[PDB]
Amino acid sequence: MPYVEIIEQPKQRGMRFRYKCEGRSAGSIPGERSTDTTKTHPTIKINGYTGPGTVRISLVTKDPPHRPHPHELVGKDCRDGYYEADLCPDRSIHSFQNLGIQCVKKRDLEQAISQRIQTNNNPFHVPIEEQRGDYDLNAVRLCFQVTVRDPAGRPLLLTPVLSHPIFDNRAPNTAELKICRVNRNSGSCLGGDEIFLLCDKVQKEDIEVYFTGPGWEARGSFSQADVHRQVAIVFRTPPYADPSLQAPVRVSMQLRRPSDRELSEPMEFQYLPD
């Protein structure tokens, strides 16, 4: 067995799935170590083979059994919702720089699933009896299906390998959590300071403000009514563990989504004596 290794996973959060109405292609999935400057792409290594062959990339469901997803991969060398291209004969490391995710509408689900079946796009060969019930339209995995050749030219299908899931950034409960701005980043160790926090879209029933430091955690105090049009929160700081401070102590403040335990990048908060 030669086999396929993912050397660069896709970035999980931050990219929108795009509708067909928004255009032919849907951009390019970044690798998880992409940045403003040096941007990267999902990448695989084929161990134990070099030479001609085929790579197919398809979308499957986040959870097992990994059914073909109703959404589509679009971009260079994509057709019928999947990517397919000749493997580069020379190298054993392969990057995919033009993969976009095009989301199907909810009313077009049954048709999309019909197309997956008709195009033999079912990497795990899931029985049709299982392709009926609920799909998570906010998450997908890439499935890499590489075919290489034996010494006589016979195709050999390597075991399919799944990426980490990719989450729709436009969707209510799977978006990147991001603190955009706060009115202040320090306050008293007694707590009770009012913070106005501007954020990317949140759901008021599935959001908290989580303060953390060495062996300490607490929560900002607010009600659902204090979440203003999903993009601002007014809350009160918690008391720090120690209500009488020698000197300033720095802690982290982040948005937390309790449903999936996801966190924003931390913002520094400084607790002050008195």
Partner DNA sequence: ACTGGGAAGTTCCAGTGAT
Partner DNA sequence: ATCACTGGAACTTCCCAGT
- # of chain residues touching a copy of itself (CB under 8 A): 16
Q: Where are the alpha helices (DSSP H) in 47-123?
A: 109-118
Extract the tokens encoding 21.
């109405």
Q: Binding of a copy of itself at residue 36 (CB under 8 A)?
A: no
Strands (E) in 68-222, as ranges, are: 72-74, 78-79, 82-86, 93-95, 100-103, 139-149, 155-157, 161-167, 179-182, 186-188, 194-199, 208-213, 216-219
Kindly tell me which residue out of 212, 239, 252, 272 binds a copy of itself, with binding defined by CB under 8 A: 239
Q: How far is CA 50 from the centre of its chain?
A: 31
Kindly tell me which residue out of 35, 90, 107, 153 binds DNA, with binding defined by CB under 7 A: 107
CB 8 within 8 A of CB 30: no
Q: Binding of DNA at residue 204 (CB under 7 A)?
A: yes
> Of residues 219-238, which lie at the interface with a copy of itself (CB under 8 A)?
219, 221
Q: Binding of a copy of itself at residue 213 (CB under 8 A)?
A: no
User: Binding string to a copy of itself for residues 133 to 162, with x set by CB under 8 A, is what?
Assistant: xx----------------------------
- Among a copy of itself, DNA, none, partner that 204 touches (CB below 5 to 8 angstroms by kind): DNA
- Among a copy of itself, DNA, none, partner that 2 touches (CB below 5 to 8 angstroms by kind): none
> Of residues 53-82, which lie at the interface with DNA (CB under 7 A)?
63-65, 75
| Spatial separation of the C-alpha atoms in residues 256 and 222, rounded to whole Å | 14
> Of residues 45-64, which lie at the interface with a copy of itself (CB under 8 A)?
none
CB 6 within 8 A of CB 144: yes
Task: Number of helices (H) and strands (E) in the chain: give both, helices first.
Answer: 1, 22
Rg for the chain, CA atoms, rounded: 23
Q: Binding of DNA at residue 191 (CB under 7 A)?
A: no
Distances (CA, A) of 116 to 67, 111, 112, 143: 10, 9, 6, 14
Footprint of a copy of itself on this chain (CB under 8 A)? 110, 129, 132-134, 217-219, 221, 239, 241-244, 258-259
Q: Which residues bind DNA (CB under 7 A)?
A: 1, 3, 14, 16, 19-23, 25-28, 63-65, 75, 98, 100, 103, 105-107, 137, 158-159, 170-172, 200-201, 203-204, 227, 229-230
